[PDB]
Amino acid sequence: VYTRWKCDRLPVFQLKLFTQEYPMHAAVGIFTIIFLWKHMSHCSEETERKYGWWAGYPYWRDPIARRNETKYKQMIINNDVDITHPKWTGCSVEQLEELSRVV
Amino acid sequence: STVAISVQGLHYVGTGLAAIALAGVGLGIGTIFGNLLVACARQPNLTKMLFNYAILGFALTEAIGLFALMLAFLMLFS
Amino acid sequence: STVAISVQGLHYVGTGLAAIALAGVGLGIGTIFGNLLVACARQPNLTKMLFNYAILGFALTEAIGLFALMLAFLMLFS
Amino acid sequence: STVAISVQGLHYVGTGLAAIALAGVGLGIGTIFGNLLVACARQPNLTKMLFNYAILGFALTEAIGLFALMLAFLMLFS
Amino acid sequence: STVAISVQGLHYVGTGLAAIALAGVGLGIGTIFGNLLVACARQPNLTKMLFNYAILGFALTEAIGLFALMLAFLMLFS
Amino acid sequence: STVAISVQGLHYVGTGLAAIALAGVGLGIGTIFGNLLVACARQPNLTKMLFNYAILGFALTEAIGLFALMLAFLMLFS
Amino acid sequence: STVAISVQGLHYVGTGLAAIALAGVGLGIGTIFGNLLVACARQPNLTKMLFNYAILGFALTEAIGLFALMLAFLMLFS
Amino acid sequence: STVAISVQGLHYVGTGLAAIALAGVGLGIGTIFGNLLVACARQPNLTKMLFNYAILGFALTEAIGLFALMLAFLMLFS
Amino acid sequence: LEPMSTWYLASWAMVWYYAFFFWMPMVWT
Amino acid sequence: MFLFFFCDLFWLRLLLCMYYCVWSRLCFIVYFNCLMLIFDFLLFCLFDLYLFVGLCLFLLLWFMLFNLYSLILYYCITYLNLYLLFCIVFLLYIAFLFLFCFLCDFFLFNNLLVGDSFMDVFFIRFLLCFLECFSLLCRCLSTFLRLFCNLLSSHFLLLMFFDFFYFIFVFFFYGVFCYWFILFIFVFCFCLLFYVFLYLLDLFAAILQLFIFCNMILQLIMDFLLFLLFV
Amino acid sequence: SNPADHFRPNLKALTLYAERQHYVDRWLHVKERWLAPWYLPWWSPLFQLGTWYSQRSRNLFLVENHLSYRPYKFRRNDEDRNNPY
Amino acid sequence: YNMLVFRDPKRRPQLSEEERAKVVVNQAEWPEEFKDFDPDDPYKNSPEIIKGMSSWNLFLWGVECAFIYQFYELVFPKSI
Amino acid sequence: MLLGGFVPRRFSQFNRDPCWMFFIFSVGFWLGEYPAMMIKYNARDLVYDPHRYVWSHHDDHH
Amino acid sequence: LCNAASKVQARSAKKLAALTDAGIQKTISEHNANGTDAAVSSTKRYLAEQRQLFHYRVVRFFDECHYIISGEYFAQYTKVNLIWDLRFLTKLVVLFLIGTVLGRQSIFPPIDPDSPLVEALVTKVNPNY
Amino acid sequence: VLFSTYRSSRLVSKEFLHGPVMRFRALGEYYFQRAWNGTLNWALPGEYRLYAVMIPFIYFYHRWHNDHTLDRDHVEKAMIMRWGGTLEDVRKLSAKDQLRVRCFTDIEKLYSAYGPKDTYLQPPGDTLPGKDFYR
Ligand SMILES: CCCCCCCCCCCCCCCCCC(=O)OC[C@H](COP(=O)([O-])OCC(O)COP(=O)([O-])OC[C@@H](COC(=O)CCCCCCCCCCCCCCCCC)OC(=O)CCCCCCCCCCCCCCCCC)OC(=O)CCCCCCCCCCCCCCCCC
Ligand SMILES: CCCCCCCCCCCCCCCCCC(=O)OC[C@H](COP(=O)([O-])OCC(O)COP(=O)([O-])OC[C@@H](COC(=O)CCCCCCCCCCCCCCCCC)OC(=O)CCCCCCCCCCCCCCCCC)OC(=O)CCCCCCCCCCCCCCCCC
Ligand SMILES: CCCCCCCCCCCCCCCCCC(=O)OC[C@H](COP(=O)([O-])OCC(O)COP(=O)([O-])OC[C@@H](COC(=O)CCCCCCCCCCCCCCCCC)OC(=O)CCCCCCCCCCCCCCCCC)OC(=O)CCCCCCCCCCCCCCCCC
Ligand SMILES: CCCCCCCCCCCCCCCCCC(=O)OC[C@H](COP(=O)([O-])OCC(O)COP(=O)([O-])OC[C@@H](COC(=O)CCCCCCCCCCCCCCCCC)OC(=O)CCCCCCCCCCCCCCCCC)OC(=O)CCCCCCCCCCCCCCCCC
Ligand SMILES: CCCCCCCCCCCCCCCCCC(=O)OC[C@H](COP(=O)([O-])OCC[N+](C)(C)C)OC(=O)CCCCCCCCCCCCCCCCC
Ligand SMILES: CCCCCCCCCCCCCCCCCC(=O)OC[C@H](COP(=O)([O-])OCC[N+](C)(C)C)OC(=O)CCCCCCCCCCCCCCCCC
Ligand SMILES: CCCCCCCC/C=C/CCCCCCCC(=O)OC[C@H](COP(=O)(O)OCCN)OC(=O)CCCCCCC/C=C/CCCCCCCC
Ligand SMILES: CCCCCCCC/C=C\CCCCCCCC(=O)O[C@H](COC(=O)CCCCCCC/C=C/CCCCCCCC)COP(=O)(O)OCCN
């Protein structure tokens, strides 16, 4: 005789279980997952340094700095960003050259 | 030498101490109701009379709590 | 060296401690109104006499409550 | 000389004192249920009437606890 | 180095502590009247002699309260 | 002169005070189960209803104690 | 460095603590009389022998209170 | 002026206060066992249910004891 | 204390959500 | 931020696969009350009162695979976080509560207004109603908090005691050969007794706490169930 | 401290980071790609489910006029209470 | 008997005293493993899994494994 | 549930079942690792790190 | 001090009588009748047998060496032999480690003069140890 | 039409890997499918031998993982911080020196909260390097 658990395959039984057996529970679970990923899915660098490492943050190599450096280099190279633009520096290119000659 | 000091965080401590008086009030209320159940379980036909007296006791112990609450508020806002 | 110090916030602390005296007073009232229910059930014919004695006990306990309350207020506005 | 001092950590101490009020509330609730158990064993036929008065007691005693918690939250966040 | 300090506000703290002893007195009063009602219900014929003894218990317990209260007032004004 | 001070270590003392509320919780739980055994000894057939109400009372008492823990952990990490 | 400090007002604090010792003394006396009323109600013919023992208990309890009171006054005058 | 202070030894004080919670726990256990003996005296045949319920409650009071002990260790080793 | 932490709470709760939505059916059948 | 980690049940999953490829009877259940809600015959409920059985069994199995095996040293309770337990209890409790509320039967809440008509509605009955509606959410919070903190405290105590035992056993065993061997023997016997007592206590409390975690949810369900009588 | 460190997951393998802007934009692109085709009319329940709630939330954000300051969600340092920046 | 928390199961008697007394015991039919059977030590004559492998030998093997685990680095240390 | 199974009467019988053989081997490991720690960590030639005061976990977590 | 001794003696006597070994009981009875010590006699018998079996051990060693070298041992190799060989290897390893420790007369390797750990040796609390 | 929703739509023959599967089931069933193996909610079996076997194995593999993956991080951190603050500085030492340092770290772990506090608190007047040695 027909029974959901014995005859249906696992994905079908899962859908039936969470749609016609525990639908409210599934709905609340999805709600909670969305909330968690919307408000509890960020970690600042200081937080990672304080608690994000098993034995502590190895300041002697600063892996966060290398990670950010790789990120920014990849972004600049791929997107063809002119980091010498006045908006990034706040001064004209000629002023930048003058400063370079000064320092 | 004469030194006058004004600690503006001490009023918190005084407020907490007053709240401890509520411990002797809430417990007192429970004692009244605890004896009420035994009294009711003995003479249930008198429940309508005992309940009024039980309320009267709560109206007095609670009044004492207000005095402690009043001090907890005066110091917490002064 | 001679040093004289005047801490002003301490008047709050004394006020809070006196409020704790009400804990026993409020609890004591509950005991009276707790036994009253038991006594009434055993002898419902004597509710009036027992009730009067319960009020007497409440007044006596309240007297101590005001004594502590007086000390609390005096140390609060002083 | 006039010196005014503001110790922040003091707001923590006042909060801890207020929490002690829960000791009386917690004990008072248990006393009510303690009498309820024996009250029903005496008269099982009244396991409904007695139960109504017990939860009435829990709510009245818990009401005092709200004030204690309110003071704690009104001083911890202050 | 030798340093002598004289804090004026400490006398408030001692006064509040002396007031706490009143709780042991106030609760004691309720106990006497808590059992007086039961005794009256048990033996109504002795409503008079028991009442006199209860008053005596109040007197002795009250006398202890005044002894503590004397210390409370002495330090409040000194 | 105006002086503002922020002590790190005062968040520990308040935490310990909140834990004291657990004393009035553990005792309250013991009171319920102490009465449960007597109630079972008096009306043993009714063990189930007594047991369920004991759990209800235990649940309510624990809820209060946790509120003390909530404050205890809030201050400990603050 | 070696520093010797002499705080004056502390004797008020110690004296207040000794006053609290009378809380149990006051409660203990009330307990004796409370049991006396029940014992008299149970055995009304023994209204004198019970009274004598109650006086003996009060005297012993009072002595304990007096022991504490001696320290309370002695520190207040030190 | 802004002043930041870091007191080291305060963590000891909070540790001791939490340990006080065990006073309401150890006593709570004694209450359960105290009732157990009485219950076993008047229902010897039903010792199985009474003993099991005593040990069940002893764990629901030991939990609260463990609650405080954890905070004590946190404030003692950190 | 990590048990009191929230800087990676979502990834931490994904374990329970996977257990509830994907392993419970297998244990059920 | 996305962290990739794994639960500490892989060996237990393997054992479950090995031992349960064939059927076997189950007769001992930690929380048996989820299968017998009605004790008086002829009483029946139109509400799906047996919906909680599957979740109860799965939760018992999961929490037992985690907590009971956590006594073994170095075993990790991967789910031990306050807010994660909050999420679990929120899911279960709020799901059942919304099941009751979606029924769109307002009369079901009549019992919230505690007491009788003879008590002041605004100043007595209504306040108590507010307090009880607060108590429901407090019950949810209490369940999750108790489950978290029992485990945390027990394991803290076990770790501390084991550290003390290791210290004394390693750095003071030589006293066996010395003249003060009796003191060390007494201390060692005391430590063994305490070790056994702690393990037994933790084993019993781990199962009791699951009894109570499931009992709170079942109590929530029972607080809104109405039984009809067959005629 | 040391006892407290024993309550951590013991099988951490990898950590990946992604800015909210980037993956939000990618999700928006995916949603636009799947909701663009003509055979999904704007009045269909699916399209409204996809778009209306997001539009409402963004509009609520834009209309917001708060007298207080809300520090940037993704600062480098948010552990300092006396430095919202 | 018990070994820590492990208790040896015991079979409940099924025969009454009258019927039991009429039973004739013939250990000749019993297997060699179970002769002079004692409930307090039913496995006294049980054969060893490995001939010549005593329990103490396995205990010493475990002790030696622990000693190796603790002392190998002392003889063959390796750089970080 | 602790219902049944082979239960050796004494130490000498632990070799009568493979599972209990593994169990006694594990017990031997457990109990013998302690004397090894005693010998290793109480040795005469063991020396504290000269730089032990350079850094410690106490300053790190503080 | 005397009651405890009597109790211990009684317990040992009960246990000694409990054993149902015919040979052990016979030897105990004979030695008690003669007033001699059975355990010491057993020790002397064992030592004499070992002294007389030394060359038997040598012959067995050579025979076992021939058996192993001939390859006959590996012809009938089984899992039990594998278990025994693993036990043998473990004993060899632990013995080697113990031998190294005794040879250098120190649990830890000695510190070279050029090592930075020499300071620790200089700062010993008790130079005698 | 593309995929069947019924488990009866077999993908392999009934005799596929019959032998190995039967051996696996034989291993599973010999000790578990018994009357005295009455589980408690599928988690706690009744067979004593199951405990006796599994508890040691679980402890062994957990301890191996902890020693070779988790505590190693703390040990390496201590070695780096106490001997230059860089990995190359530690590698400049010999294997014996690293062994000494790691065993001192183990000593500290065993001492914990009950050991002498001179292992991390420098007594006044001590000649050993301080915290600012490498700064
Ligand atoms: C008539 C024809 C006769 C033909 C005769 C032929 C005879 C000769 C043999 C033929 C050749 C072999 C055939 C296959 C044998 C398979 C083994 C077997 O026998 O199994 C037993 C059994 C035999 O069949 P049967 O018993 O006759 O019938 C089965 C029942 O009818 C229904 O079963 P059920 O429903 O009860 O259960 C099915 C399944 C439940 O259903 C499913 O799982 C199916 C759905 C799974 C989906 C998972 C992916 C989802 C991803 C998200 C969605 C993506 C959407 C993308 C959209 C498009 C994007 C563009 O159950 C399970 O999951 C549990 C069993 C799992 C087995 C264990 C798997 C791991 C083994 C690892 C061993 C090796 C370890 C490493 C060794 C290393 C050594 C160094 O078969 C199965 O159980 C089938 C299991 C299938 C699992 C699939 C999992 C896939 C995971 C990887 C996905 C990779 C994706 C990559 C994407 C990359 C993108 C960049
Ligand atoms: C082609 C797919 C469909 C395309 C679109 C079609 C047309 C539209 C459909 C409906 C759209 C609904 C719009 C929102 C309605 C109201 C709800 C709401 O507020 O939503 C907020 C937000 C949407 O943003 P929005 O408000 O519309 O506008 C942007 C805002 O400005 C953003 O503001 P915000 O502050 O809220 O932003 C924070 C963050 C907030 O984002 C979140 O919080 C994400 C939450 C995700 C919820 C997932 C629900 C399903 C859970 C199933 C059970 C999982 C159990 C645990 C499993 C753990 C281990 C895998 O927002 C986002 O970044 C949104 C990104 C959403 C990405 C969704 C990817 C789903 C992946 C599922 C993986 C499942 C793996 C199973 C493997 C099993 C293998 C055996 O998130 C969601 O709507 C989440 C649910 C999305 C459901 C989409 C349809 C079903 C899934 C289709 C893709 C499946 C991929 C499978 C990959 C497998 C790899 C192996
Ligand atoms: C960039 C680097 C790479 C990484 C990229 C990642 C991309 C991420 C995208 C962004 C995602 C954002 C959100 C992330 C949230 C994470 C949350 C989280 O982790 O929470 C903890 C939580 C922990 O869960 P749990 O309690 O540990 O249980 C989950 C376990 O899977 C166990 O649970 P269970 O046992 O209940 O699961 C059911 C299980 C039932 O049991 C089994 O099936 C047994 C097997 C279990 C496998 C799974 C366990 C994995 C164990 C560790 C890894 C194994 C070794 C890998 C070796 C790698 C070597 C490099 O069945 C399966 O797992 C089905 C798969 C079976 C595969 C069999 C393949 C056989 C191949 C045979 C080939 C033969 C070729 C012959 C050729 C001959 C030629 C001559 O994680 C989850 O719940 C799942 C999170 C997954 C989120 C989706 C991620 C996106 C998909 C990534 C796929 C990458 C594929 C490419 C990799 C290439 C190598 C590098
Ligand atoms: C740095 C390098 C320094 C190098 C220094 C130099 C090194 C040496 C170089 C050479 C020097 C010249 C040669 C000297 C040889 C001396 C040895 C000798 O020949 O002995 C033969 C001699 C027998 O010769 P015999 O009389 O001709 O025998 C006639 C028959 O053959 C008898 O046949 P049998 O059938 O009797 O055979 C068995 C017999 C024969 O077995 C042996 O041969 C034994 C091994 C012989 C060598 C012993 C060397 C000892 C050297 C010092 C320790 C080093 C470690 C030894 C490890 C031994 C492991 C077995 O077993 C015994 O001897 C038994 C002795 C143990 C009795 C245990 C009884 C304890 C009762 C406690 C009751 C307490 C109650 C208190 C109540 C209080 C109430 C208030 O046996 C002994 O002298 C035995 C001495 C055992 C001393 C053990 C001390 C251990 C440490 C103290 C205890 C600490 C832990 C426990 C404390 C518990 C709390 C109190
Ligand atoms: C170190 C600090 C520690 C702090 C710790 C603090 C406690 C943290 C505890 C976390 C774990 C426990 C979580 C329990 C669950 C909490 C749930 C919660 O509050 O989440 C609310 C949050 C609130 O969402 P929100 O934050 O996006 O709100 C938007 C509001 N505006 C735009 C004004 C800013 O919900 C979610 O996160 C899920 C939202 C999507 C799912 C629901 C969609 C339908 C909404 C229907 C109504 C509106 C649309 C109209 C009707 C439908 C039309 C189609
Ligand atoms: C229903 C109730 C069940 C009760 C079971 C009772 C079990 C009794 C165990 C007796 C002692 C066993 C000792 C084993 C020693 C192993 C080797 C070793 O070194 O370990 C030392 C370890 C640790 O000892 P340690 O802490 O002294 O180690 C010292 C090591 N240093 C110094 C480095 C720190 O011992 C344990 O922790 C064992 C505790 C066991 C507690 C009981 C666990 C019960 C729950 C799990 C049951 C699993 C059953 C699975 C069945 C299959 C399921 C499908
Ligand atoms: C639906 C496709 C329409 C267009 C035609 C595409 C043909 C591509 C060439 C395929 C050659 C190999 C075919 C092998 C047999 C496939 C049998 C099959 O589909 O069975 C599904 C079967 C599972 O069946 P059950 O659910 O257990 O029960 C089925 C009974 N109801 O699935 C499998 O096992 C996977 C088999 C995959 C085979 C390859 C399929 C490739 C499809 C590609 C489609 C896209 C167009 C390709 C164009 C190619 C041009 C050269
Ligand atoms: C080549 C080995 C020879 C072995 C002979 C041993 C003879 C020992 C006789 C005296 C023993 C008691 C000595 C008391 C003083 C010990 C002090 C101490 O610990 O000193 C260690 C010596 O200690 C050790 O190394 C040994 C520790 C204990 C070893 C244990 C051996 C195995 C025990 C197995 C126990 C199993 C259970 C048996 C229970 C029986 C009783 C119930 C050396 O270092 P110090 O210079 O003193 O200070 C170091 C500071 N940097």
Author numbering:
A (entry chain i): 2 to 104
B (entry chain V1), C (entry chain W1), D (entry chain U1), E (entry chain X1), F (entry chain T1), G (entry chain O1), ...: 41 to 118
I (entry chain c): 29 to 57
J (entry chain a): 1 to 231
K (entry chain q): 14 to 98
L (entry chain p): 26 to 105
M (entry chain r): 1 to 62
N (entry chain m): 16 to 144
What's in the article?
Mitochondrial ATP synthase consists of the soluble F1 and membrane-bound Fo subcomplexes and occurs in dimers that assemble into oligomers to induce the formation of inner-membrane folds, called cristae. Dissociation of ATP synthase dimers into monomers results in the loss of native cristae architecture and impairs mitochondrial function. Here, we report cryo-EM structures of the intact ATP synthase dimer from Trypanosoma brucei in ten different rotational states. Although overall dimer architecture varies among eukaryotes, we find that subunit-g together with subunit-e form an ancestral oligomerization motif, which is shared between the trypanosomal and mammalian lineages.
To describe the conformational space of the T. brucei ATP synthase, we resolved ten distinct rotary substates, which were refined to 3.5–4.3 Å resolution. The three main states (1–3) result from three ~120° rotation steps of the rotor relatively to the static Fo. We identified five (1a–1e), four (2a–2d), and one classes of the respective main states. Within the four classes of the state 2 the rotor advances by 23° and F1 returns close to its position observed in class 1a, where it is found also in the only observed class of the state 3. In all classes F1 is in a similar conformation, corresponding to the catalytic dwell, observed previously also in the crystal structure of T. brucei F1-ATPase13. In accordance with the ~120° rotation of the central stalk, the conformations and nucleotide occupancy of the catalytic interfaces of the individual αβ dimers differ between the main states, showing ADP and ATP in the “loose” and “tight” closed conformations, respectively, and empty nucleotide binding site in the “open” conformation.
